[PDB]
Amino acid sequence: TIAETAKIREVLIIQNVLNCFNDDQVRSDFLNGENGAKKLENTELELLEKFFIETQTRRPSFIATAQKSAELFYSTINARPKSFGEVSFEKLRSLFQQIQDSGYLD
Amino acid sequence: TIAETAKIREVLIIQNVLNCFNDDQVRSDFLNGENGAKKLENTELELLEKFFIETQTRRPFIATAQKSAELFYSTINLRSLFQQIQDSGYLDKYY
């Protein structure tokens, strides 16, 4: 129960982090490394945007989008060595962890 | 891998159903049992409303995330209502 609930919790946290990144001021603080946000490179921001696009589900097939998103979350929260863009899912997981652990969005 | 990915997918499908259900025309169809939607009663309306509220995470955060995750956990292990809506195909025709 604890381990499975923690996996769902990580998915929800990633979803929230990505949703905060839709805000432009948030994006700028990470690009500029200001106001307590850790400096992120263009490449990192682009990774976050790509993951956001590809984890959305959509009614047109819908199940195809949900399955694709579920596989992406699985690979991320299990820190797989498989590539997502130019980094491993392990590296992608660490980016979300660093953002969450920084407390900037709180 | 298969079993864990399926649990994540069920969470994603529930979230989608909820996000569609805040469209006024979708809710109208469900409350009336029109255009392919199964008729919802106040009891199921209340279930969806409270589930939506309790599964939202919000930066004032980890308390809201844990509460949402616990409700998703209890549900995927409410569950019949979401599966019936998904099985109905209504949302696949609506868009």
Side-chain angles (χ1 to χ4, degrees):
Chain A
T1 295
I2 293 172
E4 176 178 333
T5 300
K7 285 167 180 293
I8 301 172
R9 188 178 72 239
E10 187 167 352
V11 172
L12 296 173
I13 290 168
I14 293 168
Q15 287 176 332
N16 177 276
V17 169
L18 293 167
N19 277 316
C20 295
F21 272 70
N22 287 328
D23 172 346
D24 296 67
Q25 175 82 252
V26 167
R27 193 176 320 94
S28 189
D29 279 350
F30 280 93
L31 182 75
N32 302 330
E34 302 189 335
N35 300 310
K38 183 176 187 298
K39 172 99 151 233
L40 296 188
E41 310 283 18
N42 293 322
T43 198
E44 296 174 316
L45 264 296
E46 289 170 352
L47 270 183
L48 296 173
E49 174 71 46
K50 174 188 185 49
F51 190 84
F52 171 82
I53 292 170
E54 299 185 2
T55 51
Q56 300 312 288
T57 64
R58 177 179 135 286
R59 297 283 172 174
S61 79
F62 167 72
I63 291 290
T65 74
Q67 177 68 26
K68 176 185 172 183
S69 180
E71 289 172 15
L72 287 178
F73 279 114
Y74 178 91
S75 302
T76 300
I77 68 181
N78 288 280
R80 291 291 178 255
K82 176 183 188 175
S83 292
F84 184 76
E86 292 70 23
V87 301
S88 65
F89 281 101
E90 175 179 23
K91 182 60 183 163
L92 182 65
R93 193 192 190 192
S94 177
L95 174 54
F96 288 119
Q97 290 173 324
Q98 289 179 28
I99 291 162
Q100 177 60 26
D101 292 353
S102 76
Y104 167 80
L105 294 174
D106 305 309
Chain B
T1 293
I2 302 303
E4 175 174 335
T5 299
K7 287 158 175 299
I8 299 172
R9 195 181 81 167
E10 189 168 355
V11 169
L12 296 173
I13 294 174
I14 292 170
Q15 289 175 329
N16 178 274
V17 169
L18 289 168
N19 290 331
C20 297
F21 194 75
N22 288 312
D23 187 320
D24 294 326
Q25 185 61 237
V26 172
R27 192 186 59 255
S28 187
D29 287 344
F30 274 100
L31 290 190
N32 289 307
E34 289 173 354
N35 298 290
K38 195 182 131 253
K39 194 154 156 191
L40 277 187
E41 298 289 338
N42 185 250
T43 188
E44 303 162 278
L45 180 57
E46 181 170 318
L47 275 174
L48 293 176
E49 289 176 331
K50 290 175 167 176
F51 190 94
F52 174 80
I53 287 162
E54 288 167 32
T55 54
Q56 300 314 293
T57 67
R58 191 172 173 91
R59 299 285 169 173
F61 167 74
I62 187 63
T64 75
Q66 177 69 20
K67 188 183 291 299
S68 177
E70 288 175 352
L71 180 48
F72 277 118
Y73 176 91
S74 295
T75 299
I76 67 176
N77 286 281
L78 276 167
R79 197 190 186 186
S80 185
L81 178 57
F82 289 121
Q83 190 63 50
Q84 286 178 48
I85 291 170
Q86 176 66 16
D87 291 345
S88 81
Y90 164 86
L91 293 171
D92 296 315
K93 313 180 188 190
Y94 178 81
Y95 301 99

mmCIF file of all heavy atoms in Angstrom, chain B residues 9-44:
data_model
loop_
_atom_site.group_PDB
_atom_site.id
_atom_site.type_symbol
_atom_site.label_atom_id
_atom_site.label_comp_id
_atom_site.label_asym_id
_atom_site.label_seq_id
_atom_site.Cartn_x
_atom_site.Cartn_y
_atom_site.Cartn_z
ATOM 1 N N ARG B 9 -2.272 3.921 -15.711
ATOM 2 C CA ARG B 9 -3.199 4.259 -16.780
ATOM 3 C C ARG B 9 -4.615 4.457 -16.251
ATOM 4 O O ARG B 9 -5.341 5.333 -16.730
ATOM 5 C CB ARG B 9 -3.180 3.178 -17.860
ATOM 6 C CG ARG B 9 -3.833 3.650 -19.131
ATOM 7 C CD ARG B 9 -3.825 2.564 -20.188
ATOM 8 N NE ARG B 9 -4.909 1.614 -19.984
ATOM 9 C CZ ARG B 9 -5.283 0.724 -20.894
ATOM 10 N NH1 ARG B 9 -4.645 0.660 -22.057
ATOM 11 N NH2 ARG B 9 -6.283 -0.105 -20.645
ATOM 12 N N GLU B 10 -5.032 3.656 -15.273
ATOM 13 C CA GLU B 10 -6.382 3.834 -14.750
ATOM 14 C C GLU B 10 -6.523 5.195 -14.083
ATOM 15 O O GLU B 10 -7.543 5.871 -14.252
ATOM 16 C CB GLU B 10 -6.761 2.718 -13.777
ATOM 17 C CG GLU B 10 -8.259 2.810 -13.410
ATOM 18 C CD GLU B 10 -8.804 1.590 -12.689
ATOM 19 O OE1 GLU B 10 -8.059 0.594 -12.535
ATOM 20 O OE2 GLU B 10 -9.990 1.642 -12.283
ATOM 21 N N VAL B 11 -5.491 5.624 -13.344
ATOM 22 C CA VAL B 11 -5.489 6.964 -12.764
ATOM 23 C C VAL B 11 -5.638 8.012 -13.859
ATOM 24 O O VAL B 11 -6.424 8.951 -13.731
ATOM 25 C CB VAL B 11 -4.205 7.188 -11.939
ATOM 26 C CG1 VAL B 11 -4.067 8.664 -11.566
ATOM 27 C CG2 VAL B 11 -4.221 6.306 -10.674
ATOM 28 N N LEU B 12 -4.873 7.871 -14.954
ATOM 29 C CA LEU B 12 -4.948 8.862 -16.031
ATOM 30 C C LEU B 12 -6.332 8.901 -16.664
ATOM 31 O O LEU B 12 -6.829 9.973 -17.020
ATOM 32 C CB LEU B 12 -3.896 8.575 -17.117
ATOM 33 C CG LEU B 12 -2.447 8.696 -16.662
ATOM 34 C CD1 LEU B 12 -1.486 8.211 -17.765
ATOM 35 C CD2 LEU B 12 -2.119 10.164 -16.278
ATOM 36 N N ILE B 13 -6.960 7.737 -16.838
ATOM 37 C CA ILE B 13 -8.291 7.704 -17.439
ATOM 38 C C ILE B 13 -9.311 8.374 -16.525
ATOM 39 O O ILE B 13 -10.157 9.149 -16.985
ATOM 40 C CB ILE B 13 -8.679 6.254 -17.777
ATOM 41 C CG1 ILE B 13 -7.746 5.731 -18.872
ATOM 42 C CG2 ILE B 13 -10.145 6.164 -18.200
ATOM 43 C CD1 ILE B 13 -7.947 4.267 -19.176
ATOM 44 N N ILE B 14 -9.245 8.094 -15.220
ATOM 45 C CA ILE B 14 -10.139 8.750 -14.266
ATOM 46 C C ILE B 14 -9.965 10.264 -14.335
ATOM 47 O O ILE B 14 -10.945 11.022 -14.393
ATOM 48 C CB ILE B 14 -9.890 8.203 -12.844
ATOM 49 C CG1 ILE B 14 -10.337 6.736 -12.751
ATOM 50 C CG2 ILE B 14 -10.554 9.071 -11.782
ATOM 51 C CD1 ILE B 14 -9.911 6.033 -11.475
ATOM 52 N N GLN B 15 -8.712 10.731 -14.348
ATOM 53 C CA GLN B 15 -8.474 12.173 -14.412
ATOM 54 C C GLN B 15 -9.093 12.776 -15.661
ATOM 55 O O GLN B 15 -9.677 13.862 -15.609
ATOM 56 C CB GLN B 15 -6.979 12.470 -14.377
ATOM 57 C CG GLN B 15 -6.335 12.202 -13.024
ATOM 58 C CD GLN B 15 -4.835 12.392 -13.098
ATOM 59 O OE1 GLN B 15 -4.236 12.159 -14.146
ATOM 60 N NE2 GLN B 15 -4.221 12.840 -11.998
ATOM 61 N N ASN B 16 -8.979 12.079 -16.790
ATOM 62 C CA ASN B 16 -9.579 12.589 -18.015
ATOM 63 C C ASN B 16 -11.096 12.676 -17.894
ATOM 64 O O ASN B 16 -11.700 13.686 -18.271
ATOM 65 C CB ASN B 16 -9.191 11.710 -19.192
ATOM 66 C CG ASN B 16 -9.837 12.170 -20.475
ATOM 67 O OD1 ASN B 16 -10.963 11.788 -20.783
ATOM 68 N ND2 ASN B 16 -9.132 13.017 -21.222
ATOM 69 N N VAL B 17 -11.735 11.611 -17.391
ATOM 70 C CA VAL B 17 -13.190 11.618 -17.235
ATOM 71 C C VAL B 17 -13.621 12.809 -16.397
ATOM 72 O O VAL B 17 -14.553 13.545 -16.753
ATOM 73 C CB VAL B 17 -13.675 10.299 -16.603
ATOM 74 C CG1 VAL B 17 -15.146 10.411 -16.204
ATOM 75 C CG2 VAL B 17 -13.463 9.131 -17.575
ATOM 76 N N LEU B 18 -12.957 13.002 -15.254
ATOM 77 C CA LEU B 18 -13.256 14.143 -14.393
ATOM 78 C C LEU B 18 -13.084 15.462 -15.128
ATOM 79 O O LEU B 18 -13.915 16.368 -14.993
ATOM 80 C CB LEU B 18 -12.355 14.109 -13.160
ATOM 81 C CG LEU B 18 -12.675 13.008 -12.158
ATOM 82 C CD1 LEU B 18 -11.562 12.880 -11.128
ATOM 83 C CD2 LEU B 18 -13.998 13.287 -11.476
ATOM 84 N N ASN B 19 -12.005 15.597 -15.902
ATOM 85 C CA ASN B 19 -11.769 16.865 -16.587
ATOM 86 C C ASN B 19 -12.822 17.127 -17.657
ATOM 87 O O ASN B 19 -13.186 18.283 -17.890
ATOM 88 C CB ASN B 19 -10.366 16.887 -17.188
ATOM 89 C CG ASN B 19 -9.275 16.966 -16.121
ATOM 90 O OD1 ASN B 19 -9.486 17.522 -15.040
ATOM 91 N ND2 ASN B 19 -8.102 16.416 -16.428
ATOM 92 N N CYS B 20 -13.336 16.076 -18.297
ATOM 93 C CA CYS B 20 -14.433 16.258 -19.242
ATOM 94 C C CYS B 20 -15.723 16.630 -18.531
ATOM 95 O O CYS B 20 -16.535 17.387 -19.076
ATOM 96 C CB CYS B 20 -14.664 14.983 -20.049
ATOM 97 S SG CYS B 20 -13.295 14.471 -21.107
ATOM 98 N N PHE B 21 -15.931 16.094 -17.327
ATOM 99 C CA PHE B 21 -17.203 16.243 -16.634
ATOM 100 C C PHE B 21 -17.435 17.654 -16.118
ATOM 101 O O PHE B 21 -18.569 17.973 -15.743
ATOM 102 C CB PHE B 21 -17.288 15.242 -15.482
ATOM 103 C CG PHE B 21 -18.661 15.092 -14.923
ATOM 104 C CD1 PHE B 21 -19.625 14.380 -15.618
ATOM 105 C CD2 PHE B 21 -19.000 15.672 -13.711
ATOM 106 C CE1 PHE B 21 -20.894 14.245 -15.121
ATOM 107 C CE2 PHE B 21 -20.281 15.540 -13.198
ATOM 108 C CZ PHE B 21 -21.230 14.826 -13.907
ATOM 109 N N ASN B 22 -16.413 18.508 -16.098
ATOM 110 C CA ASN B 22 -16.610 19.903 -15.729
ATOM 111 C C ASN B 22 -17.071 20.764 -16.895
ATOM 112 O O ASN B 22 -17.319 21.957 -16.703
ATOM 113 C CB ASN B 22 -15.326 20.482 -15.139
ATOM 114 C CG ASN B 22 -15.039 19.941 -13.759
ATOM 115 O OD1 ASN B 22 -15.922 19.915 -12.895
ATOM 116 N ND2 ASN B 22 -13.811 19.493 -13.545
ATOM 117 N N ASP B 23 -17.164 20.193 -18.092
ATOM 118 C CA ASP B 23 -17.825 20.851 -19.211
ATOM 119 C C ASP B 23 -19.333 20.823 -18.979
ATOM 120 O O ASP B 23 -19.909 19.761 -18.735
ATOM 121 C CB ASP B 23 -17.448 20.131 -20.509
ATOM 122 C CG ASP B 23 -17.956 20.828 -21.761
ATOM 123 O OD1 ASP B 23 -19.096 21.344 -21.767
ATOM 124 O OD2 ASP B 23 -17.205 20.827 -22.762
ATOM 125 N N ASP B 24 -19.975 21.995 -19.044
ATOM 126 C CA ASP B 24 -21.389 22.084 -18.679
ATOM 127 C C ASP B 24 -22.263 21.214 -19.578
ATOM 128 O O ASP B 24 -23.258 20.642 -19.119
ATOM 129 C CB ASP B 24 -21.861 23.538 -18.729
ATOM 130 C CG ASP B 24 -21.191 24.411 -17.679
ATOM 131 O OD1 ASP B 24 -20.903 23.917 -16.563
ATOM 132 O OD2 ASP B 24 -20.945 25.597 -17.984
ATOM 133 N N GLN B 25 -21.911 21.099 -20.860
ATOM 134 C CA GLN B 25 -22.717 20.283 -21.767
ATOM 135 C C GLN B 25 -22.562 18.799 -21.464
ATOM 136 O O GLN B 25 -23.520 18.026 -21.599
ATOM 137 C CB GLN B 25 -22.340 20.564 -23.219
ATOM 138 C CG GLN B 25 -23.224 19.843 -24.235
ATOM 139 C CD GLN B 25 -24.688 20.236 -24.131
ATOM 140 O OE1 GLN B 25 -25.559 19.389 -23.931
ATOM 141 N NE2 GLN B 25 -24.965 21.527 -24.275
ATOM 142 N N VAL B 26 -21.356 18.381 -21.085
ATOM 143 C CA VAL B 26 -21.152 17.003 -20.663
ATOM 144 C C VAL B 26 -21.992 16.702 -19.428
ATOM 145 O O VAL B 26 -22.715 15.701 -19.378
ATOM 146 C CB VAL B 26 -19.653 16.739 -20.411
ATOM 147 C CG1 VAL B 26 -19.463 15.381 -19.793
ATOM 148 C CG2 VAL B 26 -18.871 16.848 -21.721
ATOM 149 N N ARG B 27 -21.912 17.564 -18.408
ATOM 150 C CA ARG B 27 -22.686 17.306 -17.196
ATOM 151 C C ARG B 27 -24.182 17.315 -17.494
ATOM 152 O O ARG B 27 -24.932 16.492 -16.958
ATOM 153 C CB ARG B 27 -22.365 18.317 -16.100
ATOM 154 C CG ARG B 27 -22.957 17.883 -14.727
ATOM 155 C CD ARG B 27 -22.793 18.930 -13.633
ATOM 156 N NE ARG B 27 -23.434 20.180 -14.010
ATOM 157 C CZ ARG B 27 -22.777 21.261 -14.412
ATOM 158 N NH1 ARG B 27 -21.449 21.251 -14.477
ATOM 159 N NH2 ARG B 27 -23.451 22.350 -14.752
ATOM 160 N N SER B 28 -24.632 18.237 -18.347
ATOM 161 C CA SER B 28 -26.036 18.247 -18.752
ATOM 162 C C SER B 28 -26.441 16.902 -19.340
ATOM 163 O O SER B 28 -27.476 16.331 -18.970
ATOM 164 C CB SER B 28 -26.285 19.367 -19.760
ATOM 165 O OG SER B 28 -27.668 19.494 -20.035
ATOM 166 N N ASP B 29 -25.626 16.372 -20.255
ATOM 167 C CA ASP B 29 -25.945 15.084 -20.862
ATOM 168 C C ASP B 29 -26.032 13.990 -19.806
ATOM 169 O O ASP B 29 -26.950 13.163 -19.834
ATOM 170 C CB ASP B 29 -24.901 14.725 -21.926
ATOM 171 C CG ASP B 29 -25.031 15.567 -23.187
ATOM 172 O OD1 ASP B 29 -26.087 16.212 -23.370
ATOM 173 O OD2 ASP B 29 -24.081 15.568 -24.002
ATOM 174 N N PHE B 30 -25.087 13.971 -18.860
ATOM 175 C CA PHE B 30 -25.102 12.936 -17.837
ATOM 176 C C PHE B 30 -26.293 13.088 -16.893
ATOM 177 O O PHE B 30 -26.920 12.092 -16.515
ATOM 178 C CB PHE B 30 -23.779 12.949 -17.070
ATOM 179 C CG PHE B 30 -22.702 12.135 -17.738
ATOM 180 C CD1 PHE B 30 -21.720 12.747 -18.496
ATOM 181 C CD2 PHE B 30 -22.696 10.753 -17.626
ATOM 182 C CE1 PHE B 30 -20.739 11.994 -19.120
ATOM 183 C CE2 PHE B 30 -21.721 9.995 -18.243
ATOM 184 C CZ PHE B 30 -20.740 10.621 -18.995
ATOM 185 N N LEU B 31 -26.638 14.321 -16.516
ATOM 186 C CA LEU B 31 -27.781 14.507 -15.618
ATOM 187 C C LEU B 31 -29.104 14.173 -16.291
ATOM 188 O O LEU B 31 -30.069 13.809 -15.607
ATOM 189 C CB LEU B 31 -27.804 15.936 -15.083
ATOM 190 C CG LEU B 31 -26.664 16.226 -14.099
ATOM 191 C CD1 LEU B 31 -26.878 17.563 -13.420
ATOM 192 C CD2 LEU B 31 -26.514 15.100 -13.064
ATOM 193 N N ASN B 32 -29.172 14.274 -17.618
ATOM 194 C CA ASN B 32 -30.396 13.977 -18.351
ATOM 195 C C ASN B 32 -30.402 12.597 -18.990
ATOM 196 O O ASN B 32 -31.463 12.145 -19.433
ATOM 197 C CB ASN B 32 -30.626 15.039 -19.434
ATOM 198 C CG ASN B 32 -31.024 16.375 -18.851
ATOM 199 O OD1 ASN B 32 -31.962 16.456 -18.062
ATOM 200 N ND2 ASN B 32 -30.294 17.426 -19.209
ATOM 201 N N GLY B 33 -29.262 11.917 -19.045
ATOM 202 C CA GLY B 33 -29.209 10.653 -19.749
ATOM 203 C C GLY B 33 -29.472 10.827 -21.231
ATOM 204 O O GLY B 33 -30.212 10.038 -21.836
ATOM 205 N N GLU B 34 -28.886 11.859 -21.808
ATOM 206 C CA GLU B 34 -29.038 12.172 -23.204
ATOM 207 C C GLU B 34 -27.752 11.987 -24.007
ATOM 208 O O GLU B 34 -26.685 11.857 -23.470
ATOM 209 C CB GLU B 34 -29.444 13.632 -23.353
ATOM 210 C CG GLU B 34 -30.855 13.970 -22.918
ATOM 211 C CD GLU B 34 -31.150 15.458 -22.936
ATOM 212 O OE1 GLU B 34 -30.267 16.261 -23.167
ATOM 213 O OE2 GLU B 34 -32.283 15.838 -22.718
ATOM 214 N N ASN B 35 -27.886 12.021 -25.321
ATOM 215 C CA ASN B 35 -26.773 11.924 -26.243
ATOM 216 C C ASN B 35 -25.764 10.813 -25.988
ATOM 217 O O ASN B 35 -24.601 10.976 -26.260
ATOM 218 C CB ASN B 35 -26.049 13.255 -26.305
ATOM 219 C CG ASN B 35 -26.907 14.361 -26.822
ATOM 220 O OD1 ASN B 35 -27.230 14.381 -27.985
ATOM 221 N ND2 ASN B 35 -27.256 15.310 -25.967
ATOM 222 N N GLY B 36 -26.227 9.686 -25.489
ATOM 223 C CA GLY B 36 -25.368 8.554 -25.221
ATOM 224 C C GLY B 36 -24.884 8.437 -23.799
ATOM 225 O O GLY B 36 -24.305 7.404 -23.443
ATOM 226 N N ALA B 37 -25.113 9.438 -22.970
ATOM 227 C CA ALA B 37 -24.665 9.375 -21.601
ATOM 228 C C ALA B 37 -25.625 8.645 -20.702
ATOM 229 O O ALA B 37 -26.810 8.793 -20.826
ATOM 230 C CB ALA B 37 -24.437 10.764 -21.083
ATOM 231 N N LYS B 38 -25.099 7.855 -19.790
ATOM 232 C CA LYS B 38 -25.924 7.146 -18.841
ATOM 233 C C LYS B 38 -26.372 8.148 -17.813
ATOM 234 O O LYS B 38 -25.606 8.951 -17.377
ATOM 235 C CB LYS B 38 -25.163 6.051 -18.147
ATOM 236 C CG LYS B 38 -26.061 5.069 -17.425
ATOM 237 C CD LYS B 38 -25.284 3.995 -16.680
ATOM 238 C CE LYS B 38 -25.732 3.793 -15.244
ATOM 239 N NZ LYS B 38 -24.739 4.345 -14.279
ATOM 240 N N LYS B 39 -27.633 8.075 -17.447
ATOM 241 C CA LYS B 39 -28.212 8.980 -16.498
ATOM 242 C C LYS B 39 -27.578 8.888 -15.139
ATOM 243 O O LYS B 39 -27.467 7.844 -14.592
ATOM 244 C CB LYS B 39 -29.719 8.765 -16.384
ATOM 245 C CG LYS B 39 -30.392 9.899 -15.655
ATOM 246 C CD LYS B 39 -31.831 10.066 -16.027
ATOM 247 C CE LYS B 39 -32.576 10.764 -14.927
ATOM 248 N NZ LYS B 39 -34.042 10.695 -15.184
ATOM 249 N N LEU B 40 -27.169 10.018 -14.615
ATOM 250 C CA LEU B 40 -26.558 10.070 -13.324
ATOM 251 C C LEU B 40 -27.582 10.496 -12.326
ATOM 252 O O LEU B 40 -28.385 11.305 -12.639
ATOM 253 C CB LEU B 40 -25.534 11.179 -13.305
ATOM 254 C CG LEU B 40 -24.120 11.071 -13.803
ATOM 255 C CD1 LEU B 40 -23.395 12.341 -13.438
ATOM 256 C CD2 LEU B 40 -23.425 9.883 -13.219
ATOM 257 N N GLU B 41 -27.518 9.991 -11.114
ATOM 258 C CA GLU B 41 -28.412 10.433 -10.065
ATOM 259 C C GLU B 41 -27.629 11.354 -9.133
ATOM 260 O O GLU B 41 -26.439 11.465 -9.253
ATOM 261 C CB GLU B 41 -29.000 9.273 -9.311
ATOM 262 C CG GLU B 41 -29.845 8.380 -10.184
ATOM 263 C CD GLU B 41 -31.148 9.018 -10.588
ATOM 264 O OE1 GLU B 41 -31.603 9.951 -9.900
ATOM 265 O OE2 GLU B 41 -31.728 8.575 -11.574
ATOM 266 N N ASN B 42 -28.302 12.016 -8.210
ATOM 267 C CA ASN B 42 -27.603 12.934 -7.318
ATOM 268 C C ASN B 42 -26.505 12.230 -6.536
ATOM 269 O O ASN B 42 -25.461 12.833 -6.254
ATOM 270 C CB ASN B 42 -28.572 13.596 -6.336
ATOM 271 C CG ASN B 42 -27.890 14.644 -5.478
ATOM 272 O OD1 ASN B 42 -27.700 14.464 -4.271
ATOM 273 N ND2 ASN B 42 -27.488 15.742 -6.109
ATOM 274 N N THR B 43 -26.728 10.965 -6.176
ATOM 275 C CA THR B 43 -25.719 10.220 -5.429
ATOM 276 C C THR B 43 -24.432 10.072 -6.232
ATOM 277 O O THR B 43 -23.336 10.262 -5.693
ATOM 278 C CB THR B 43 -26.274 8.856 -5.007
ATOM 279 O OG1 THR B 43 -25.352 8.219 -4.118
ATOM 280 C CG2 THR B 43 -26.513 7.958 -6.203
ATOM 281 N N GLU B 44 -24.541 9.758 -7.527
ATOM 282 C CA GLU B 44 -23.344 9.633 -8.362
ATOM 283 C C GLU B 44 -22.764 10.998 -8.701
ATOM 284 O O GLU B 44 -21.540 11.148 -8.789
ATOM 285 C CB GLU B 44 -23.653 8.864 -9.651
ATOM 286 C CG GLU B 44 -24.240 7.484 -9.432
ATOM 287 C CD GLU B 44 -24.928 6.951 -10.672
ATOM 288 O OE1 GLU B 44 -26.101 7.324 -10.902
ATOM 289 O OE2 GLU B 44 -24.308 6.151 -11.406
#
